[PDB]
């Protein structure tokens, strides 16, 4: 599914309000961007993750 693998945060369903306040259901998708990390002997394994976790990954020194 279109979801992060580090966390479990997925899509957010909401309304597409326009002029005249017409209601149409729309979907916000999370920023799944490929990322490689070093875990368990630095083993790199491509993992589709949200940009938020990527920023979290960058500051936490893991990403090097």
């Amino acid at each position: 599914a279109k979801k992060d693998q580090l966390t479990l945060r997925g899509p957010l369903y909401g309304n597409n309000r326009s002029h005249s306040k017409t209601i149409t259901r729309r979907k916000w998708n999370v920023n799944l961007q490929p990322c490689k990390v070093k875990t368990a002997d630095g083993k790199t394994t491509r993992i589709l993750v949200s940009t938020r976790t990527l920023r979290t990954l960058k500051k936490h020194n893991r990403l090097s």
Partner: protein
């Protein structure tokens, strides 16, 4: 964001320094190439206290790099004979990492980011030149021979 760098780089800094470089060149180029390091001891004042150990850590990794240079300089026996038509068809088809199928594990590691060889990796049937850079001052010259099995 703040990054300390290890080796000598044409821009930014020389040996120790603190540079504010974008993460693209830092997290993708400077870090995997051991040209830089993240926040030392996780802060700035922590970095200042640990620099009195970072100097000697840089000395000893340079020292082991010199040890790595002697090990490759004592053998120069990385041999490979190609299987081809031979007379009109001469070219090394080992790419580059087949030669590293004879360095890492069997002998001195000689990592993929360490050997600054050209993109032709040798295409001759005679003695050639391998250049490897442990640091920004040491130049490695290897002479491998080639031929037909």
């Amino acid at each position: 964001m703040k990054v300390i760098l290890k080796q000598d780089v044409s821009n930014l800094g020389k040996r120790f320094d603190v540079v504010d470089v974008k993460d693209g060149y830092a997290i993708h180029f400077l870090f995997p190439k051991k040209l830089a390091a993240p926040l030392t001891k996780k802060s700035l004042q922590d970095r200042d206290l640990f620099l009195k150990k970072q100097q000697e850590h840089y000395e000893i990794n340079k020292a082991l790099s010199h040890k790595l240079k002697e090990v490759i300089e004592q053998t120069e026996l990385h041999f490979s004979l190609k299987e081809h038509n031979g007379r009109p068809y001469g070219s090394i088809i080992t790419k580059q990492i087949i030669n590293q199928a004879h360095t890492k594990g069997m002998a001195l590691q000689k990592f993929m980011f360490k050997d600054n060889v050209r993109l032709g990796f040798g295409d001759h049937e005679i003695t050639l030149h391998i250049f490897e850079d442990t640091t920004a001052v040491l130049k490695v010259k290897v002479t491998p021979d080639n031929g037909v099995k």
